[PDB]
Each structure stands twice: as C-alpha cells, then as structure tokens.
Amino acid sequence: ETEIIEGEVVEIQIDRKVGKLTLKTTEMETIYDLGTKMIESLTKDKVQAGDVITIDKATGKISKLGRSFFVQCPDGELQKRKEVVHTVSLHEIDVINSRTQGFLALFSGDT
Amino acid sequence: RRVLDRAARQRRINRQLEALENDNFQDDPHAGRKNFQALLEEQNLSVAEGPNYLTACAGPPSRPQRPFCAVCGFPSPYTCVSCGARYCTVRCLGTHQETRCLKWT
Amino acid sequence: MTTLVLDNGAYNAKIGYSHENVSVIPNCQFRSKTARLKTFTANQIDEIKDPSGLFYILPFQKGYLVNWDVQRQVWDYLFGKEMYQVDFLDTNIIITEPYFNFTSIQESMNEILFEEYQFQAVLRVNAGALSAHRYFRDNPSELCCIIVDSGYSFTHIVPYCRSKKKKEAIIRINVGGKLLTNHLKEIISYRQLHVMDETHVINQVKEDVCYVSQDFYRDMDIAKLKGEENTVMIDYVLPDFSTIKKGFCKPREEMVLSGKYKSGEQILRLANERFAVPEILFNPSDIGIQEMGIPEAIVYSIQNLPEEMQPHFFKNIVLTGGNSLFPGFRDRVYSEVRCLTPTDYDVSVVLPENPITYAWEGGKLISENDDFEDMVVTREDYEENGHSVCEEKFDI
Amino acid sequence: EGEVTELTPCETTISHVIIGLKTAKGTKQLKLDPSIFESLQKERVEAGDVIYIEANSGAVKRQGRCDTYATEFDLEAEEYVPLPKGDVHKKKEIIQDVTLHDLDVANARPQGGQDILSMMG
Amino acid sequence: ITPGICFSTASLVLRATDVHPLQRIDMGRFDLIGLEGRVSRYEADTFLPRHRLSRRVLLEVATAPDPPPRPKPVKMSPFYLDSLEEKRKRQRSERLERIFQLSEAHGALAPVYGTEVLDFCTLP
Numbered sequence A: 001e002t003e004i005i006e007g008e009v010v011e012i013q014i015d016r017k018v019g020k021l022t023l024k025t026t027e028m029e030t031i032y033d034l035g036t037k038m039i040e041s042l043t044k045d046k047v048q049a050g051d052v053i054t055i056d057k058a059t060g061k062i063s064k065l066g067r068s069f070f071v072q073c074p075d076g077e078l079q080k081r082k083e084v085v086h087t088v089s090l091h092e093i094d095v096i097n098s099r100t101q102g103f104l105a106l107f108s109g110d111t
Numbered sequence B: 001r002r003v004l005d006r007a008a009r010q011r012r013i014n015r016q017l018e019a020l021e022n023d024n025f026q027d028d029p030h031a032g033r034k035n036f037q038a039l040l041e042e043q044n045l046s047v048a049e050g051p052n053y054l055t056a057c058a059g060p061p062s063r064p065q066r067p068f069c070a071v072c073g074f075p076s077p078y079t080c081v082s083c084g085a086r087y088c089t090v091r092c093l094g095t096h097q098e099t100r101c102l103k104w105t
Numbered sequence C: 001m002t003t004l005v006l007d008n009g010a011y012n013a014k015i016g017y018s019h020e021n022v023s024v025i026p027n028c029q030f031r032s033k034t035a036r037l038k039t040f041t042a043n044q045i046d047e048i049k050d051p052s053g054l055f056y057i058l059p060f061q062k063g064y065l066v067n068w069d070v071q072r073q074v075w076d077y078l079f080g081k082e083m084y085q086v087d088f089l090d091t092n093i094i095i096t097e098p099y100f101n102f103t104s105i106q107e108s109m110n111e112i113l114f115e116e117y118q119f120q121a122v123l124r125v126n127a128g129a130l131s132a133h134r135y136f137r138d139n140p141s142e143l144c145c146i147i148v149d150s151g152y153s154f155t156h157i158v159p160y161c162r163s164k165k166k167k168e169a170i171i172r173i174n175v176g177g178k179l180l181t182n183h184l185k186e187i188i189s190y191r192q193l194h195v196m197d198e199t200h201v202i203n204q205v206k207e208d209v210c211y212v213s214q215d216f217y218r219d220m221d222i223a224k225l226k227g228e229e230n231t232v233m234i235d236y237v238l239p240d241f242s243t244i245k246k247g248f249c250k251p252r253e254e255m256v257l258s259g260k261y262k263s264g265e266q267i268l269r270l271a272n273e274r275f276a277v278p279e280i281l282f283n284p285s286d287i288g289i290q291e292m293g294i295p296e297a298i299v300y301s302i303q304n305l306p307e308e309m310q311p312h313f314f315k316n317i318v319l320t321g322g323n324s325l326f327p328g329f330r331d332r333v334y335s336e337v338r339c340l341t342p343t344d345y346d347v348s349v350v351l352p353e354n355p356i357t358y359a360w361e362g363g364k365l366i367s368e369n370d371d372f373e374d375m376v377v378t379r380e381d382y383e384e385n386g387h388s389v390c391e392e393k394f395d396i
Numbered sequence D: 001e002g003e004v005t006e007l008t009p010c011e012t013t014i015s016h017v018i019i020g021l022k023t024a025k026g027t028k029q030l031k032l033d034p035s036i037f038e039s040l041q042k043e044r045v046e047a048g049d050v051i052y053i054e055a056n057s058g059a060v061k062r063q064g065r066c067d068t069y070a071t072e073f074d075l076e077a078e079e080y081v082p083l084p085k086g087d088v089h090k091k092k093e094i095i096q097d098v099t100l101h102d103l104d105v106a107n108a109r110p111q112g113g114q115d116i117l118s119m120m121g
Numbered sequence E: 001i002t003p004g005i006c007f008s009t010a011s012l013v014l015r016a017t018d019v020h021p022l023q024r025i026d027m028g029r030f031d032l033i034g035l036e037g038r039v040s041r042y043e044a045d046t047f048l049p050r051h052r053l054s055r056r057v058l059l060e061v062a063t064a065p066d067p068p069p070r071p072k073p074v075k076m077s078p079f080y081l082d083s084l085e086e087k088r089k090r091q092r093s094e095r096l097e098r099i100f101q102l103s104e105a106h107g108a109l110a111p112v113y114g115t116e117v118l119d120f121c122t123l124p
C-alpha cells in the first residue's frame, strides 16, 4: 500500500529550509507544509503553478503529467491510499540484487 | 476565497481554549469578587523570581503536534487554505466551509 | 479535641472527621430552571430531579478560590447544624490548598478561618503533601516519591522527599477534568447534537464511556471502520429524567448499525471521542495546548532533580486525582515513562484503590501523629504572630 | 538499536561520541569510538532517526525516522519506522554456516575503499 | 531527448540480500585482501605478539584512578542502591570483556604479503 497525492498545483513557495505547497482538485484545496527532502525533490523537478503532477509521498517521486488551464484537473480526494501490485520475476530479483545499480542489466544484458 | 492572517488564527485558538475553561455556556436562570487575571496582575509575579506559579507552567512538548480533522476527529492530511483548519475528506471540507470557515457560525 | 479534615477541591469536597469515614460532596452551588428562587448548596444537588440545564456556581476559577461568597455559603452549610455541627472554638481543621497559592488567597484563608469561624487551630497543606505522607506511611522503606495529581481543574506533578516538597521541580499541566468535559461537550455539539447546556450529563458520559488507548492509531483505524469490526463504537442513551433516571450504554448484542431505533430515545453515538478526550492528558497538543503531557512532565521534573535521587523518584510514581480513574491510564503512564526513563532505572507506577480519597486518608493519618501539635497554628499565637507565622510554618 | 535522542561529539579532533538511543524499554547512553562518527555523518544521522550500531564493527545504518515525528511536516519524502520494541542493547548467539568458496570470493576483490581506484572498481 | 525509463519494482525486492546484524557473523575475521596496503609485517610478527593487551592489564588500567595531569614544560550515602551499583559494575565488566575480545579479534590476522614486502618488490 502506498499514499499517492495527485492534483493541480496552485501555488508553490520556498523560502530560506521551509516551504509551502497549495494543491487543488475539482472538489478540494489544501496547503501543505513541506519538509527538506520534498522541497529538494520539488526543486530538482521544475514545478510551477498550473502543472498537474502526482507525488509518491514516501519517496518524493514527482512526475509531471501535463498542464491544466493538457490534462483535466483531478476530481476527488487529493491524498489517496492505493494498493500497488508488482509481479517480479526471479531473474529480475537476481539482477537487481546482483550489484549496485544492477537493475541496469535488465535492459542492456550485461548480466 | 479570503485569507486570514496569523492574528485572526491565534485569536480564534485563544478564544476556543478560554471557552474550554468556562464554567457554564448559558446565563444565570435567575437573571437578577475578582477573576484569575486580576489575581495575577495583583500578585505582580515576575519570571525567574524564584519558584512560583508562572515558572511552573509546562513547557512546549518535544513531540510534534499531530493534526486531527476539525469535523470528525480522524487524522487529517489536509490543511484548509483559508483558515488553517485541518480536514480529512471532501464531505468534511464542505461541512467546515459551511460551518466554521471565515465567519464563525 | 476533634480534628476536621477537608479537601476543598474545585469539584468535590472530601470532608469528614478524623475518627469517622469520608464523604464526597460537590463544592459548588447549583441553580435550576425548575426552581424560581432556590439556590442549591453543596450536596443539595441530590434533591433536584431534573439536573438537565443545571447552572453551576463555582468558587474556583482555574483551580484557585476566587469567589468567596459561594465558598463561604458552602462552608457554612457543611459546618452547620445540618451536616457536621462543628464546634469551632475547640476543633482543629486540616484544609487543603492549591499549589502555588497566591498570597492574597492565603491571607484571606487565614483571616476567615481564624476570625470568622475562630477555629482552635488550622493546618493548611496541599493535597499532594497528604498523599505523599500516606504513601510514605504505607511504604516505609522508600525515601522519595513523586505524586501526580490529575484533578478537576489542573494536573500537577510534585516530587516529595521524606519531609519536604521540591518546589523547584513542581510541574503543572493546564489540562483537567473540567477541560476534558468542556471539550467533549464542544465535540458532541459540533458533531451530533447540541449538549452545551448538559454539563452534568456529558460529565457522566465521560466518566462512563471514555478510556485511554494503548495504541492510538490502531484504535483510530478500528473506529473508522463500519459494521461489526468497529468494536470501539458504542451507543449511549442520555437520561431524559422522566423514565431513564441515569444514562447507560446499550448492549453490543442490542446495537443497531443503521442508528434508527423504534424507541424514541435520544441516542448519542461516540466512536473516536472515547479515547480522544482522555488522550489530551497525555498529549495536550492534540487540542492546541503547547504543553507537555503527564509522562513527559514526570520525566522532566525528575530529570531536573539531582542525579543521585533519580532512581528513587522513578521507582515511586503515584497517581492521585479523579482523572487517574480512566481505564488504561496506569498502563499508558507506565509505558510512556518506561520509554523515556533510562534503562538502568526501574519504573513503578502505583494506582491506589480510591485516588479520590487518597488525600483525605493522608490527612487522617497526619492528624493521628504525635507531631501534629507542632504543625498547627493556634489562635492565641495568631493574635500576635499569626500573619507572619502562618506563612513561616506552612510550606505552601 | 533505537531512536537517536542525542548525538554529541566530545572534543579533546574528537575523543569520543556520546549517543542517546531510545527504545520501548528505556534509554541508554553509549560512548562511541571516534571512527564511528564518520559513519554517523555519512549516513546523515540526526536526532529522531532510528539507527542500529554494530558493536564489533561500528557499522551504522539509519533505517528511517521515528514515527513519533511523522507529523512534523505535512509532506516530506521520508520513511517513518516504528520505535524498536526490545532493549537498546541486543545480544544474540548465532551459528552460521559458510563455505570455503564464500571466503575465496570474499577475498578475491576488495570491498569499500575511499580511493579513486576502488570507487571506479 | 526522451524521458528515461521508470522501472517500478516491489519495495521488498530491494531488501532481498539484506541480512540483520543479529543474524550474520562478522566476515572481517577472514578479510585477507583488506590487510594489503594497510597492515605491515612488523605489526603482525614483532609488535602485536609482544604488546597485545591482557585481561589483567585492561582491568588494572580501568580500575586505577585517572593519571596525574601532565606537567607543564619548563625551560631547563543515603540514596545509595546496591542493585543499581551491581548492575553498573556488571555493565563495566561486560564492556571491558568486549573491549578485550574486539582488540584480540581485530589484530589476529597477518597479511599474506604485507606492506614491507610489497614496497620492496614494487619497482618505480
């Protein structure tokens, strides 16, 4: 189970670290108090007002899936607990755990 | 929507906390001497002047505050932009906006 | 000759004679809309039959005696011919005082006790002192103890040596039974039905249904469910004072999930308020009070004191007061203090059978001692030296 | 193992490291060899983090933040872990089987190493 | 320019090789290749056999009081508990035993070649 935050960015504020982030759906709007790691993640991936993004809360994995004013803004709750199911082959486990950055061998041979 | 400054939020929090110390919410059914603040101001009680009442007030907790929904009490990931109140669901947000956001109804 | 023991609490007065038992009587006057011109005093609340919409006239604001007229009337009723028939000129009185009591209140207490009643001798102590004395009488091998007094209007934590109170380490929490009851009233009014005028009924509800959770978030998850798996949720039938004299909880087998009942009972459904209200004692910041809870305050008070004494303090934590009667209070306190206490130091928390009357028992014990006469202040000495020597002798 | 309540290097260079670890069964104060301070700084260990320290090797692993601090921000990319249940000091007597080939391959190539050649290797 | 491939896997997969310290032995007692370039033949053969600590010396140093301060250069019990002190002295004894065992373990292995031999055999 993972917590996924998907919404439209309203306002992003970062000050010298503390920051605030305001996200909205078609049904609710919220302001978040950001931590250092999420602030760094949002700085690394340029995020501006109007972008529709999804955030993996535990990892900070932010992927921009378009802009809205093109993808329609999400409708329901901003923060959703989702059940993610992965089917991983034994070869995949072996290659991932064979060495550091070993997952690259799943794509380029080099096992 | 409108936005409330820090002073308004602090005043609301202080008013709610003081209201929690009220003896009764209604008025006297008969309908026809000091208070604590008067006693404090008369005592002229100064900080660091030995063990006294004020120095005994507990300090801030180390563990961070845990947010709870202002409507139903369950944990609340969201903070209302307008007033800073916490909430957990679209239904709870609607109830908060109708009831206690902005004007205190 | 005889000695009177009184715990002039903000909610209940534990008044009795040293040679007799203890009585619990509300220390406040009452007015009701069922009486046009009639103010009830002290235990007269038993006479009223419709305590709904009851109005409370309290002599304590924020746990200190601030209203003198109502307190005087209550004392006159308690000391009058109806209750105890106290012979003032030949009786010693042991009366409790709030911690860090203001000088003006002490002056007024001494003046009233020594002039308006003319008691033979007065001994003013704190309830925690009597509780400590009782604990040390019970446990003679222990040299130190720490007393937690979670009462109606506040929650103090006071460490006591064998015969002295460490005033430097006293910690007060501004969370008490009054605050919890008002918070429960506000929650119920905001969520289900308006009960802000039903302080008595909501207080009884808190006393009957609330409990302290060992796992806060597990209980929150359980309460959030719907159906049979929501074991936390219960149904309470408020007393209408017509056919239901006192409130009660519906049995689980008789519970209806839909919430609609053919009987026209006004049913109040509490799921997360069961443990949210008692949790304010351990986490004041839950409602907005930036103060440390009971366990953190205990540990901080003990760690302020010298290192050599610390293991003795951690081994003798004593819980007194009404708020300590919540289910799971002792286990939660022990768990949190053990979590914060250094591992080499053993932690022992003791909950007496009657935390309400612990101070009264301590006062009875201190009255029976042979050193009692040295502690009290007489009226003959009051005439000349009293106003200084009351401050000098009493360790308030 | 436990949540870090205090991390104080003692200056004479660093003579020793005083650390405070918290568990459900109490708190323990430990004096650390100064070489472990480099490991603590590399792992980015701060107060409130749940770590374990190997007594024989000084290895430090920061296995997340304590869940008591989960509400310190509304959105941080952190992994919050429950406070450990047992004592701070945990002893276990174990019997592990290894083969000679394991030792051969363990000694075939170097491990760790802050040099440029080791890193490129 | 294309975005990279985001390969998503189960969080449990990244912990497959991880073994808890209480479940694994110390593999540093068989580390021969780690001693090369760091440990010398002198340390293994002449110094350590002579200047290894003993339990007696360790206990004597631990129990003895602090040494007197180094001279400056010159140009020429009511609260006492028996159980707590017994626990503390048991902890001190355990700590000293651990120090001894770790000091013995960390210098038991001798290099296959050693720094001196490698330096001698290494031409410019």
Ligand SMILES: Nc1ncnc2c1ncn2[C@@H]1O[C@H](COP(=O)(O)OP(=O)(O)OP(O)(O)=S)[C@@H](O)[C@H]1O
Residues within 6 Å of the ligand: C008, C009, C010, C011, C012, C013, C063, C098, C127, C150, C151, C152, C153, C154, C176, C177, C178, C203, C206, C207, C208, C321, C322, C323, C325, C326, C356
């Ligand atoms: N079974 C119970 N469970 C929970 N709370 C209870 C219970 N019985 C009594 N109380 C509470 O106990 C409080 C009164 O306790 P007391 O300590 O006797 O008050 P008091 O000492 O007279 O006033 P203070 O605090 O000393 S000034 C009230 O707030 C009650 O709600």
Ligand SMILES: [Mg+2]
Residues within 6 Å of the ligand: C007, C009, C010, C127, C151
């Ligand atoms: Mg009391």
Ligand SMILES: [Zn+2]
Residues within 6 Å of the ligand: B069, B070, B071, B072, B073, B074, B087, B088, B089, B092
């Ligand atoms: Zn809600």
Ligand SMILES: [Zn+2]
Residues within 6 Å of the ligand: B080, B081, B082, B083, B084, B085, B096, B097, B100, B101, B102
């Ligand atoms: Zn709002």
